[PDB]
Structures are given as structure tokens and as C-alpha cells.
Amino acid sequence: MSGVEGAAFQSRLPHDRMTSQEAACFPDIISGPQQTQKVFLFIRNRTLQLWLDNPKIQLTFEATLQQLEAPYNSDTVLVHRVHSYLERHGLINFGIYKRIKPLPTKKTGKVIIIGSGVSGLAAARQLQSFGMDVTLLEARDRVGGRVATFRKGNYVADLGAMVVTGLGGNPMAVVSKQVNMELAKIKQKCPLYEANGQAVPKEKDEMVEQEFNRLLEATSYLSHQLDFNVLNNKPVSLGQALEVVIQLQEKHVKDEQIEHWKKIVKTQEELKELLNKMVNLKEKIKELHQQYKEADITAEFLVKSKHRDLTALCKEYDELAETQGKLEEKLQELEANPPSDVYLSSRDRQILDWHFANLEFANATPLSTLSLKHWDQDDDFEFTGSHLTVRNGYSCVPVALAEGLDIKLNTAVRQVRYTASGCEVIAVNTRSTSQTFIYKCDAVLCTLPLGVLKQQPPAVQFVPPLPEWKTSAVQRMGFGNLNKVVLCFDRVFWDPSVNLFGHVGSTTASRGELFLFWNLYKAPILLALVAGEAAGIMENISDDVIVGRCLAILKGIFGSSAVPQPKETVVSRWRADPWARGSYSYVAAGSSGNDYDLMAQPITPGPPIPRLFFAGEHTIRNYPATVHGALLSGLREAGRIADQFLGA
Ligand SMILES: Cc1cc2nc3c(=O)[nH]c(=O)nc-3n(C[C@H](O)[C@H](O)[C@H](O)COP(=O)(O)OP(=O)(O)OC[C@H]3O[C@@H](n4cnc5c(N)ncnc54)[C@H](O)[C@@H]3O)c2cc1C
Ligand SMILES: O=CCCc1cc(F)cc(F)c1OCc1ccccc1
């Protein structure tokens, strides 16, 4: 594919037609001749290409006009329109870049942003570029939110986001170039170790995995082909459907076991009756063998008759022992080819629970909480390319984003007042909570995590309270959990050529406890994941004991002598973290992707213009629970807000 077509793809745009969004802002193009539309698209793609080819400097209108070839560089008005649209919507001149045109010194409109994670920072930089007065209020003593990098000595380790999900179409590709993230592709191989330390043999790792795929497709067939979505008044969870399809495979195994037993018994009865019938014939021949020995002309003919009759019963017998053979032959082969005894052996199921845990990792919640119909509604939006880890720590992104922003750390928002005339945010200093702050403004952008919005009683009071249609969405939606244990050693004792290895838990309930180990970093560091039901429960374990359990697993895989005591350790507790209350959102049973749209919807105080805006990973339907989705949501909101307070 070409250069300009690649730029559309990298911007998540169809290279050869206009989006609905573009059709709204450029109606004259839609109703116009086909030729002009083709010219529009080329101007849009080429502008994106100029920006994506060098995202480190601002791409100005003037510079765009100068790098277009004829006849495109001659339609100055259209070029400005396109450049302005792309800039407003954050498709060019986003992230951190050298400004050509320095910042307008008289600001226009005052926006408070709640929260200094990627969504807040991304919006903030936009709004600051559009010439507004932006202040962020962050409760932690750092920026980044759920991007949190641990650094001590040579050790670098991410406690929140750590993976970049393909660069094709990914806005983080731009930010990576801007910020100089060291990215590294993740090697796919992931050996598993049973709870006793033994490696899972390849036959089984392969067999179980393929059966995990088949099981999971069956739940999709149930949902998206049989409408198995609402059972006895309740929406079906993924975990529930998974139980169903396992139960049928178990039924299928039991039934072919029954058919086999029936085939055995039938052949045994045949042999039992045939042998008895052969028994009676030996007796019948016993009595004729006796008459033949006793034996005149009627005697001379008596012998021929007795011989003719004695050998006829031997033909009957020899012919039955022939059938005797082809039965006990058919029997012997059936006693040797039993079908499966059980669908899953005890070890097989434990290994299968690993794959389930891996999916509870990806979604941050136990499977029995996920919406069967919608849990993967975002799959059509995945980026192309291999996944990467941030070898220098993902915190480099929000820290770069924070440069030059008016960011008030240790400032926790307690109440958001919004009315038709303006807004007031009330916050306390987390170091001296008697100290209070009152921030007047024209608009509030709320990037508070869904976990904080769900908090009952509320951590942040809204005045007037949020409308029912918004609170209903917040209650319906899922906010999951996921935790990491960071182990820093003075020497690498694991396989260096492997990024991942799995610990197969002993029980289904605990299947997510320390189930996946990551080797990601220059220094000798391991990350152990705690997923599913284990995530929330493990937060109540002291660090010394949970690390002891890691070392117990690792000493089982590598030997008790090869595993030294760690020099430094860190354990996340995202659920108990008051500024997150969880890891990220998931589509809960009974929710749907539509709730992500309602989360993004701004609030207008009744009689009118909107004042309270929403960004964050829980507000972007096609990219939830990700860093880039948070980034995209901040860009989106900055465009929405600038449209309102500067003009569309
Ligand atoms: C353990 C873990 C692993 C993850 N794995 C990945 C991964 O590899 N890749 C990926 O793309 N995503 C992953 N994610 C998800 C990703 O980190 C998030 O989607 C993303 O960080 C969303 O950030 P946000 O800006 O929307 O919210 P946040 O980063 O939470 O920002 C909200 C901010 O508001 C602040 N705040 C809270 N309450 C208040 C208050 N009262 N007043 C003021 N400020 C307040 C918070 O401190 C925070 O800074 C993971 C997340 C976690 C936690
Ligand atoms: O550590 C953080 C993982 C959380 C996460 C949340 C998402 F919504 C999407 C992700 F890509 C993702 O991170 C990498 C990943 C990819 C596939 C399966 C599991 C994890």
C-alpha cells in the first residue's frame, strides 16, 4: 500500500471515503461533484502523512500548503478547512511536539481537568494548544494515573499499563516517536508449569489450548447465532455459557462411553450364546461319535450313513468356531479401543483453568461477570502489528505529556458544582486535608476512573447530582481488577529468551493467583500477575507473604537453590487504591457497548449549554480499558469542548 493511504490507515480512517464525522463538517463536499470529494480525501490523507512522517514538530497550515503539489496547493481555502478539521479533532498536532506558533498569551475560557492520567493530560495539551486556560487537579503525588512505573536503582517495572497493542492505527505510535519510548516486541512462547513445578508436556499444552479455543467459539455460536443471551430473566455471563458448553462435551463423552459399553455387552452375549450353542453341538457329536463306533449290508450302508452324518455336524461345528473367532476378534478390538474416560482429566482441567485465568487477566474480571453477548464488542478495532512492552517504563509517556501544564498534584477533588453560569471544583490538599481549594471555571472535564465514579458513598459529590441516565450507566458497567507482584533479583535464573511463563494453579477458584510471569526488562525483573477472583482477595495479603508464594512457585520450577531472595519487591493493590478502585472497565453482563457512549455524553444543567465533560478509558466504546483509548478520549473531549467555547 501507498504513503497517503497508509496515513489514513494509521489514523483509523477509510482512505477512500469520508467518515460520517467528515460528512457533517464538510456537507458541501458530500453534495458536491465526485471529483471534489476525491480532492478532499487526498488533501486529508496527505496532511495526515505530513504529520505522521514527522510528529515531533507542529504541522502548520502554511507548511501544509507548501508541501502539497499542484493542483492541490492551489485550493487554499479547502486546504485550510481540512487542516483545521484535523487539528481540532486531534488527528494532527496532538501529543508533545515543538510548537512553531507559540502559545497565545491571552487565554480564552477556563477549564478544570480532574485527573492527570493519559486522558486528562491528552485533553489538557490539546486545550492548551487551542489557547484555553487549563488547570489539572490530580490527587496523587504524580501524574500518569493507571500508568505507574516503579524505579529504584537499575530496576524499572510497570505496575499499571505495560503493553502497546500493535502500532498499525495506534495513536501511541505517534506518542512513541515523540517521547522516545523503548519498545520491544513480546515473544509469543509461554511454557506452563503444573503446581508441582513439572512442565506441561507439549502434547497437553497443545491439546488443552485447542480445546480452550473450541469451547470459546461455542459460546460465541450460542450468543451470536442462537441468541442464548437471556435465561430466566437474567443476562447470560461468559462464565455461565462456558459451563454450559463444557457440560455438553461431558455429556458427549459419557454417551460415547455408554455406546461402547453397549457394543461390548452385545458381543459378549453373542459369544456367550454361541459358546453354549457350540456346547450343545459337542454333546450332539458326543452321542453320534458313540453310534459310529459300534458299526451286514444294512451295516455297510449304516457306516456310510453314520459317517455322512458325523461329518455334517463337524461342518456345523467348524463353521461356528469360525464365527466364534470373528466375534472375539471384534470383542478384543473393542476392549482395546475405549473412547475417552472423561472429557477433562484432573490435570487437564487445571491446565484449562490457566487459559480461563488468562482471559480473566485480559478482561480484569471473573468470567462469570462478563456479558456473553458483548464482552468482546471492540474486537473489530484491534490494531495490526505485534505487541510491545515499554522497556524504559510506560511512565515516560504521561511525564512527557505533563511538560508545561498547570498541574496541581496532591489536590484531591471532593465536589463538582456545575450550573448554567459556570462551574466550581472543590478540592483538599491530601497532605493537609484542612487546606481547601475552590476553582471557578467555565467547564469541568472529568476523567475520574469508573471505580471512583462507582464509589458508594461517593468520593466526589456532584452538585446537582448526575442525571439518572448517567448514574444508571455507571452502575451497570463493570470495573475489574488486576494486580502485579514485582520481583527484582541480582541475577537472572529464568529462561532469558522467554518473556512469559505460566503457573498452573491447583484449583478453579484460585486459578488466577500468580498465574503468569513476565520477563520484560534489562534488569533481572519478574512480574507475577494476580487475576480473576484472586486479584481482589490477594490485596489482603502482606507483601512478605505474597512474595513468599511467588518464590515458592519459582523454586518449584527452577529448584530451591537457584532462586535467591529478591533485592526489591513491589505489589500493586489497584482495587484498594482510592484514586482508581480497580484496574479498568469491562462490559458487565447486562451492560453493553452503548453504556460507553453514555459515559462520554456531557451534562447540561437544565434551563442551555454543557458544562461537565467526561473522558477516560471507560468513555470510549471502540477502545475501552486501554492507554490509547484513554488518549483518544482526551483528544475527543478537547475537540468537543473547544467546539463549544471557541466555535465549530
Ligand atoms: C494493572 C493494570 C494493567 C493494565 N494493562 C494495560 C496495558 O498493558 N496496556 C494498556 O493499554 N492498558 C492497560 N491497562 C489500562 C490502562 O492503564 C488504562 O486504560 C489507562 O491508564 C486509562 O487512564 P485514564 O486517564 O482514563 O485514567 P487514570 O490513569 O486513572 O487517570 C485518572 C486520574 O484521576 C486521578 N484521581 C482520582 N480521583 C481523583 C480525585 N478525587 N481528584 C483528583 N484526581 C483524582 C487519578 O489519580 C488518576 O491520575 C492496565 C491497567 C492496570 C491498572
Ligand atoms: O497489563 C495490562 C493489560 C491490560 C489490557 C487491557 C486491555 F483492554 C487491552 C490490552 F491489550 C491490555 O494489555 C495487553 C493485553 C492484550 C491482550 C490480552 C491481555 C492483555
Residue numbers in the entry: 171 to 465, 473 to 784, 792 to 832
Paper text:
Lysine-specific demethylase 1 (LSD1), the first identified histone demethylase is also known as KDM1A, AOF2, or BHC110. It is a flavin adenine dinucleotide (FAD)-dependent histone demethylase responsible for removing mono (me1)- and dimethyl (me2) groups from histone H3 lysine 4 (H3K4) and lysine 9 (H3K9) residues. LSD1 functions in transcriptional repression as a component of the CoREST (co-repressor for element-1-silencing transcription factor) complex and the NuRD (nucleosome remodeling and histone deacetylation) complex by demethylating H3K4me1/me2. Via its modulation of gene expression programs, LSD1 is an essential regulator of stem cell differentiation in both embryonic and adult cells.
We previously developed an N-alkylated trans-2-phenylcyclopropylamine (2-PCPA)-based inhibitor, S2157, in reference to the 2-PCPA-based cell-permeable LSD1 inhibitor, S2101. In this study, we downsized the N-alkyl group of S2157 to synthesize a compound named S2172 and investigated its efficacy as an LSD1 inhibitor. S2172 exhibited stronger LSD1 inhibitory activity than S2157 (Ki value of 0.27 ± 0.06 vs. 0.37 ± 0.08 µM), while the other three enzymes were not inhibited. S2172 had a kinact/Ki value of 9800 ± 570 M−1 s−1, which was better than the reported value of 7800 M−1 s−1 for S2157. To analyze the mechanism of inhibition, we next solved the crystal structure of LSD1 in complex with S2172. In the crystal resolved at 2.62 Å, S2172 formed a covalently linked adduct with FAD in the catalytic center of LSD1, through a cyclopropyl carbon atom. The overall structure of the LSD1–S2172 adduct was similar to that of LSD1–S2101 or LSD1–S2157, suggesting that S2172 can inactivate LSD1 by a mechanism similar to those inhibitors. The adduct of S2172−FAD and nearby residues of LSD1 are colored magenta and orange, respectively. S2172 exhibits efficient brain penetration and a reduced inhibitory constant (Ki) compared to both S2101 and S2157. Thirty minutes after a single injection of 30 mg/kg via the intraperitoneal route, S2172 reached a brain concentration of 1.52 ± 0.14 µM and a maximum plasma concentration of 0.75 ± 0.09 µM at 0.5 h, indicating a good brain-to-plasma concentration ratio (2.06 ± 0.39).
